[PDB]
């Protein structure tokens, strides 16, 4: 194990004040640090903590080639779509995981942060696209979507749609329509050179045994 | 696919010479035929064409056990009441749609067919009833209505009333007081073979490739 000691900045991801819209999701790169995941999997905060290709309790034993933390807000009934092989407006047009995903998907209800008494409309999702999004592709365009045969010429009209729609979040919504903050931790467990490692304590180097 | 024949008899519904009164609305059952709904929807003359749970282009891609076509004349400003969850003398006493309706409502102005210079009084509607209709219930009864305490004994009087009233369609009426022909299409899928379908398109043949 390498002899660095600075802990990874997960507080800057999970305790950020504003999250992104799911069409315009954030990505943070995590590198050259000690990743204690126990602060995450021993927390009582999270309504979802699903790991893929790894188990949560094993994470403090591992080293990771690179780590990415991706952040956005969605509805409670859309957290289902943040998994490998899924489909629907979020998986198809906003945020796609690869089928071979290695990492963890973490989500908590944020109806006390991301809802306002008149409705909060700051958060959006893409409703229309010509084709499905590739794994970890991002699309922040606002071209008018052409649903039919005639060109739109950058103007909404018959079969010509603005591609993004807002989530209106009220504190009174049923839980499947409340806002959830989602973090996706993504990493490669292949034995390439690794700058992120769990809190493991190294021994001396013993030879001829 | 085999070439397109046995088209559904929508011309017998939409181009009938005389329509029903709304209290005595006609029902036609459509089965065992090819239904090109886009030939209806692309036709001119429809002042209303509203679909619930379906779209006309998607109906050409769907199959049903039966289609029901219900038809009648109403006043032009009563067409508002031919929808899920509506109230008023048409929706309440004459023709009721369910709240879970799957179907299309089509209406057009028929002033040149259904008005007379002497006034046309051949079309009637139910003015008085004990209680509101069930969805797709019909009531052709002519028993004298009682608003008072005495039994009317089949005789009109002080507050004993004939339950049906005529429209008086004059060609000079304002457009809300003119006659409108209405067709409601209900799509039915059972535990049975889907005998009604949209037309299947064919390419050319390509031999030697």
């Amino acid at each position, epitope marked *: 194990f390498p002899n660095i000691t600075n802990l990874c900045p997960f507080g800057e991801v999970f305790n950020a004040t504003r999250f992104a819209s799911v069409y315009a999701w954030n990505r943070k790169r995590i590198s050259n640090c000690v990743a204690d995941y126990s602060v995450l999997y021993n927390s009582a905060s999270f309504s979802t903590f699903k790991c893929y290709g790894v188990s949560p309790t094993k994470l403090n034993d591992l080293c990771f080639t690179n780590v990415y933390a991706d952040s956005f807000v969605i509805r409670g009934d859309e957290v289902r779509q943040i998994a490998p092989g899924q489909t629907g407006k979020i998986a198809d047009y906003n945020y796609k995981l690869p089928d071979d995903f290695t990492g963890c998907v973490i989500a908590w209800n944020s109806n006390n942060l991301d809802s306002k008494v008149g409705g909060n409309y700051n958060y959006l999702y893409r409703l229309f696209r010509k084709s499905n999004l590739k794994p970890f592709e991002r699309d922040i365009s606002t071209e008018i979507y052409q649903a039919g045969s005639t060109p739109c010429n950058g103007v909404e009209g*018959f079969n010509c749609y603005f591609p993004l729609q807002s989530y209106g979040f009220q504190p009174t919504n049923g839980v499947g329509y409340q806002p959830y903050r989602v973090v996706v931790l993504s990493f490669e467990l292949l034995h390439a050179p690794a700058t992120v490692c769990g809190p493991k304590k190294s021994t001396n180097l013993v030879k001829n045994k | 696919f085999p070439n397109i024949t046995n088209l559904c008899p929508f011309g017998e519904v939409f181009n009938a010479t005389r329509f029903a009164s709304v209290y005595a609305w006609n029902r036609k059952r459509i089965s065992n035929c090819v239904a090109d709904y886009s030939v209806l929807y692309n036709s001119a003359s429809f002042s209303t*064409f509203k679909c619930y749970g379906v779209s006309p282009t998607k109906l050409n891609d769907l199959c049903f056990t039966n289609v029901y076509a219900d038809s009648f004349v109403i006043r032009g400003d009563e067409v508002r009441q031919i929808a899920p969850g509506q109230t008023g003398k048409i929706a309440d006493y004459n023709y009721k749609l369910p709240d879970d309706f799957t179907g299309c409502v089509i209406a057009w102005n028929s002033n040149n067919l259904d008005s007379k210079v002497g006034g046309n009084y051949n079309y009637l509607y139910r003015l008085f009833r004990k209680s509101n209709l069930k969805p797709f219930e019909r009531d052709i009864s002519t028993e004298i209505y009682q608003a008072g305490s005495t039994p009317c004994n089949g005789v009109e009087g002080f507050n004993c009333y004939f339950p049906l009233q005529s429209y008086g369609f004059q060609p000079t009426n304002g457009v809300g007081y003119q006659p409108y022909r209405v067709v409601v299409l209900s799509f039915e899928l059972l535990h049975a073979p889907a005998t009604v379908c949209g037309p299947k398109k064919s390419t050319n043949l390509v031999k030697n490739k």
Partner: antibody
Amino acid sequence: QLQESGGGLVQPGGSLRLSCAASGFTFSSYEMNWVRQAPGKGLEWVAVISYDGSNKYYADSVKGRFTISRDNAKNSLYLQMNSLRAEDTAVYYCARLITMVRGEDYWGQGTLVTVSS
Amino acid sequence: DIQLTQSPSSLSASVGHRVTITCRASQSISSYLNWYQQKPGKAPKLLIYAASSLQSGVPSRFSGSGSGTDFTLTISSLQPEDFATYYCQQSYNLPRTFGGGTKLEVLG
């Protein structure tokens, strides 16, 4: 919030430039419109411009005579008006118009242009 | 160019009445028809979009219907804040056109 500026009295055959400043929404994402209302009359659309300025369209009453423009760095919409007639006397409004997708609409407070000798 | 006719040019009503106003297009526009309210010296406020969809924060007493050429706006139980001028607008093609709005001008 939308705020129109640049109105007032003008001589017939003259020119004017309207401007409209946007605050509290992503102006850069949207088509924007000019709409007008002559004193005691109904609403009348004037012109539209795309989110990036690539396409522009006009009413036939104003085509050639008026030009619509924007810059998204300044959150600002403009209407250059030339060959002003007495016919052009109206409150002019700066607006985001809804079509078929749910969103928040915005209309400015409107600015009055008066054209007479 | 699509012409829109608004049928009652002015209405008179009292608080708690139902009110209806109608708009009639010169060609089919599917469901592409907005409704606006305007009060004297203020900008228009959008009530209904598509032809039936209630705009964010608008009172549930307003409703729209129509798909084709004939459209209606209703006010289910009229209130002291509803006495205003009402405009339809087609969203279907350019130029964007408005109906000559209905006044609702007796307050009682």
